[PDB]
Design an enzyme around this catalytic site. Structure first.
Site, PDB file in Angstrom:
ATOM      1  N   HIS A   1       0.904  -1.210  -0.013  1.00 25.62           N
ATOM      2  CA  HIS A   1      -0.107   0.047  -0.121  1.00 25.62           C
ATOM      3  C   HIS A   1       0.725   1.311   0.105  1.00 25.62           C
ATOM      4  CE1 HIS A   1      -3.704   2.149   1.963  1.00 25.62           C
ATOM      5  NE2 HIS A   1      -2.927   3.156   2.120  1.00 25.62           N
TER       6      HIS A   1
ATOM      7  N   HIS B   1      -5.676   6.746  -2.266  1.00 20.31           N
ATOM      8  CA  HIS B   1      -6.533   5.860  -1.764  1.00 20.31           C
ATOM      9  C   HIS B   1      -7.844   5.526  -2.813  1.00 20.31           C
ATOM     10  CE1 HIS B   1      -4.532   6.950   1.969  1.00 20.31           C
ATOM     11  NE2 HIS B   1      -4.163   5.613   1.960  1.00 20.31           N
TER      12      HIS B   1
ATOM     13  N   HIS C   1       1.762   4.165  -3.153  1.00 16.35           N
ATOM     14  CA  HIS C   1       1.554   5.824  -3.057  1.00 16.35           C
ATOM     15  C   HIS C   1       2.785   6.224  -3.441  1.00 16.35           C
ATOM     16  CE1 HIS C   1      -2.092   6.151  -0.507  1.00 16.35           C
ATOM     17  NE2 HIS C   1      -1.568   5.550   0.738  1.00 16.35           N
TER      18      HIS C   1
END
Ligand SMILES: *[C@@H]1O[C@H](CO[C@@H]2O[C@@H](C)[C@@H](O)[C@@H](O)[C@@H]2O)[C@@H](O[C@@H]2O[C@H](CO)[C@@H](O[C@@H]3O[C@H](CO)[C@@H](O)[C@H](O)[C@@H]3O)[C@H](O)[C@H]2NC(C)=O)[C@H](O)[C@H]1NC(C)=O
Ligand SMILES: *[C@@H]1O[C@H](CO)[C@@H](O[C@@H]2O[C@H](CO)[C@@H](O[C@@H]3O[C@H](CO)[C@@H](O)[C@H](O)[C@@H]3O)[C@H](O)[C@H]2NC(C)=O)[C@H](O)[C@H]1NC(C)=O
Ligand SMILES: *[C@@H]1O[C@H](CO)[C@@H](O[C@@H]2O[C@H](CO)[C@@H](O[C@@H]3O[C@H](CO)[C@@H](O)[C@H](O)[C@@H]3O)[C@H](O)[C@H]2NC(C)=O)[C@H](O)[C@H]1NC(C)=O
Ligand SMILES: *[C@@H]1O[C@H](CO)[C@@H](O[C@@H]2O[C@H](CO)[C@@H](O)[C@H](O)[C@H]2NC(C)=O)[C@H](O)[C@H]1NC(C)=O
Ligand SMILES: *[C@@H]1O[C@H](CO)[C@@H](O[C@@H]2O[C@H](CO)[C@@H](O)[C@H](O)[C@H]2NC(C)=O)[C@H](O)[C@H]1NC(C)=O
Ligand SMILES: *[C@@H]1O[C@H](CO)[C@@H](O)[C@H](O)[C@H]1NC(C)=O
Ligand SMILES: [Ca+2]
Ligand SMILES: [Ca+2]
Ligand SMILES: [Zn+2]
Length: 535
Positions: A90, A100, A94
């Site tokens: 995750h 998100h 980014h």
């Protein structure tokens, strides 16, 4: 959710620094996450060597990253409890350029944000951006996305959710922490032009009449049959009889002819990029106990001609007639082909044969230990809270013995499995150092798909530590020698340590999704390996 400006795109391999404020566990978890990127995408990473923009991984408060390439170099924080595959992936997404999933421009068609529920300072994680800043990459909103928050994220109150799906079913689905979704990989491929991946070398399911480009030899006695899954009880592993006239396996009958007859099934030529590979496949042996399945390699003899044979492993029929998983380590550094030899023994005592499906070949290590629990969908109903199952004993490359405990109904957390690791006494113990110290455990529940890009295998990571201690053993280290800190079992003549692991490893409802229980049986992989050299 991908940042639109092309000046934010990386040029691979991304140079990285691992900082010494990370623990060993976090360094090992980050390198494990880079292997997952190399296995499912064309994204790649290298040690720093002095370059203009780079990612430095550090331990600060919480998990966070800047979004996209910042040309002066940037920081990725992995705090306490962040050191898990899905969380590292995750933060790397980014840095690669993704916000998100709830930050998409269309998100208000799919989810509700309850703004007065968000704890102060975290509210920007629920911002949505205009299509000038962000692309959809022509993909729909994905509730299964690794980039989507769970309902109870940054909530003021433990009973009231911060984010909820407009269609109420998906409240049980959003916020998964398994792996990349299929749409997440499609987005990543569309952003960076990945048509291939660095570490999936071959795979096959036998579902097209081409048989994945496999060929049959003529120095053998007979041929493997490409078999139709139509005959009663003869179901294929890829689909297990779900689709009519449309599931295919390779078969070698052993019920007729002479003993010691054989058939060779042989791959197309492969060009390895690494020094080591793992060949995974599913098989059955319903024939004679003297029937054999042998795996061979044929490789370049250095004249450029693929002729040199090497035998790598042999398999034989126990009394279990259901599908079994197999792993074979290969060590090929020049072009080669992988080969299956089926061989008859005692044909007048065979009513069956050898079966193959679902081959996968990756430029990785193989899992150090593998456990299959049969009839798991029934075990889950017949087992009281706090009853347990235990794996057979495995061994490291280093020679340490280990195993896993499964509590199918976790008394610590209802509606979850509790899966945990223990160290076993073994034939080597006298020469090994104790306590075990900085060895990283990786436990994985296999999502049973033949293409690795379709697999969302659940995985958890920890590093054995001098800080792991228990009141049950007079506050001494759990990973000390199992004859002094374990308990004896008649099941394997082992001493097994106190176990450490996760209540809440996976939920019963998540375990019934996807391919975790494909044949109503559960496959757990385990690795246990030294990471001290990352210090
Ligand atoms: C002839 O075949 C029989 C039976 O084999 C069975 O029937 C065939 C038609 C095939 O369908 C086979 O896949 C199927 O197994 C052989 O009998 C088997 O012998 C072995 C060795 O004695 C038995 O294994 C033992 O099992 C006991 C526990 O029951 C263990 O304690 C032992 O350590 C060992 O593992 C096996 O159970 C037995 N199978 C059955 C179902 O009877 C037979 O040996 C074979 N003979 C020849 C000449 O090959
Ligand atoms: C990764 O994060 C760390 C922490 O945010 C960054 O280090 C920080 O660098 C800034 C800019 O140099 C420092 O600010 C300066 O601090 C001094 C006092 O220490 C002050 O006199 C200056 O006026 C200025 O405010 C900051 O303190 C420093 N933090 C630490 C703990 O070292 C680092 O640069 C980031 N790395 C990358 C590549 O993004
Ligand atoms: C992935 O592939 C796409 C498609 O090939 C790449 O997009 C293309 O990138 C080039 C630059 O490498 C663009 O050329 C530039 O166009 C702008 C005007 O738009 C011009 O000012 C520049 O001088 C240059 O000619 C090209 O237009 C662009 N095409 C598309 C369809 O966007 C993309 O860069 C690749 N991304 C990577 C490197 O992963
Ligand atoms: C957190 O949310 C729960 C659920 O809304 C709140 O519990 C309710 O509180 C009201 C008012 O006291 C009661 O009438 C309900 O019967 C309660 N329901 C439950 C499930 O207990 C709780 O008060 C909230 N806590 C905070 C921090 O405000
Ligand atoms: C898992 O459960 C199935 C269903 O109960 C078992 O299959 C049966 O096994 C018995 C005993 O061998 C047979 O008499 C039945 O005819 C079988 N039924 C079916 C549907 O095949 C299976 O053996 C169990 N497996 C394990 C390992 O416990
Ligand atoms: C722990 O201490 C108790 C009391 O001294 C003793 O009976 C027991 O044998 C000790 N166990 C270990 C792990 O040494
Ligand atoms: Ca042949
Ligand atoms: Ca198949
Ligand atoms: Zn995030």
């Amino acid at each position: 959710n991908g940042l639109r400006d092309p000046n934010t795109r990386w040029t691979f391999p991304i140079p990285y620094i691992l900082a010494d404020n990370l623990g060993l566990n976090a360094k090992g978890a980050i390198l494990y996450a880079f292997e997952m990127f190399r296995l499912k995408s064309c994204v790649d990473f290298k040690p720093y060597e002095g370059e203009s923009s780079y990612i430095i991984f550090q331990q600060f408060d919480g998990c966070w990253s800047e979004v996209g390439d910042q040309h002066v170099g940037q920081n990725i924080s992995i705090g306490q409890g962040c050191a898990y595959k899905a969380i590292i992936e995750h933060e790397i997404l980014h840095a690669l350029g993704f916000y998100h999933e709830q930050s998409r421009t269309d998100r208000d068609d799919y989810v509700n944000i309850w703004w007065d529920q968000i704890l102060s300072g975290y509210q920007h994680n629920f911002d949505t951006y205009d299509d000038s800043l962000i692309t959809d990459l022509n993909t729909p909103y994905d509730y299964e996305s690794l980039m989507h928050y769970q309902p109870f994220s940054f909530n003021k109150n433990a009973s009231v959710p911060t984010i909820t799906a407009k269609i109420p079913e998906f409240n049980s689905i959003i916020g998964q922490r398994l792996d990349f979704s299929a749409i997440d990989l499609e987005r990543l491929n569309r952003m960076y032009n990945c048509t291939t991946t660095h570490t999936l070398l071959d795979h096959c399911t036998f579902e097209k009449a081409n048989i994945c480009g496999m060929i049959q030899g003529t120095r053998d006695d007979t041929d493997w049959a490409h078999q139709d899954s139509a005959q009663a009880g003869e179901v294929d592993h890829t689909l297990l009889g779900q689709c009519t006239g449309a599931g295919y396996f390779m078969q070698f009958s052993t019920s007729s002819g002479s003993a010691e007859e054989a058939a060779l099934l042989e791959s197309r030529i492969l060009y390895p990029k690494r020094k080591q590979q793992c060949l995974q496949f599913f098989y059955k042996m319903t024939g004679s106990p003297s029937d054999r399945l042998v795996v061979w390699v044929r490789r370049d003899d250095s004249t450029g001609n693929v002729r040199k044979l090497v035998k790598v492993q042999t398999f034989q029929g126990d009394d279990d007639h259901n599908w079994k998983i197999a792993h074979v380590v290969l060590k090929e550094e020049q072009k080669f082909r992988y080969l299956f030899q089926g061989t008859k023994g005692d044909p007048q005592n065979s009513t069956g044969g050898i079966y193959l499906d679902d081959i996968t070949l990756t430029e990785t290590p193989c899992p150090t230990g593998v456990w299959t629990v049969r009839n798991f969908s029934q075990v889950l109903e017949n087992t009281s809270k706090g009853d347990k199952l235990q794996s057979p004993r495995f061994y490291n490359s280093e020679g340490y013995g280990f195993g896993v405990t499964l509590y199918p109904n976790s008394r610590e957390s209802s509606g979850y499995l509790r899966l945990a690791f223990h160290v076993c006494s073994g034939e080597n113990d006298a020469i090994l150092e104790w306590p075990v110290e900085n060895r990283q455990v990786i436990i994985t529940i296999l999502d049973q798909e033949p293409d690795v890009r379709n697999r969302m295998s659940s995985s958890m990571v920890f590093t054995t530590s001098k800080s792991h201690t228990s009141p049950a053993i007079n506050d001494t280290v759990i990973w000390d020698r199992p004859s002094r800190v374990g308990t004896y079992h008649t099941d394997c003549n082992c001493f097994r340590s106190i176990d450490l692991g996760w209540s809440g490893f996976i939920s019963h409802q998540m375990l019934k999704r996807r391919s975790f229980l494909k044949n109503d049986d559960l496959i757990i992989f385990v690795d246990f390996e030294d990471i001290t050299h990352l210090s």
